[PDB]
């Protein structure tokens, strides 16, 4: 399910990168940090 | 028909529209509108 939602945002960022917007490393770096934060708290509660 | 001619004549001179046009043209001479300038204004 986690692989499904990351494949959804993978095809979403492919749709972003087809449309050629500015500042994609900054924005998808922030969002990769956000998914890393959410996966950290999910792994924390899962190890609990 | 004396009274109809009198009252419709009074209503006819009430229905002259010259003063509205002359006050309108007076207002646009008092405005004196110019187009020209920088086409953005801040």
């Amino acid at each position: 399910t986690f692989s499904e939602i990351l494949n959804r945002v993978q095809k979403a960022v492919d749709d972003l990168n087809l449309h050629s917007y500015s500042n994609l490393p900054i924005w998808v770096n922030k969002l990769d940090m956000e998914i890393e934060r959410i996966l950290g708290v999910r792994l924390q509660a899962g190890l609990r | 028909g004396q009274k109809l001619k009198q009252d419709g004549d009074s209503f006819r001179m009430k229905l002259n529209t010259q003063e509205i046009f002359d006050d309108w043209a007076r207002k646009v001479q008092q405005r004196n509108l110019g187009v020209s300038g920088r086409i953005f204004t801040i």
Partner: peptide, 28 residues
Amino acid sequence: RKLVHDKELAAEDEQVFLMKQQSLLAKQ
């Protein structure tokens, strides 16, 4: 020699661009 990351090209805010064009009009 990594991907040395580019500087973030920022959209200018409408107030700072309007004070910039206010300075541009005030210099005109």
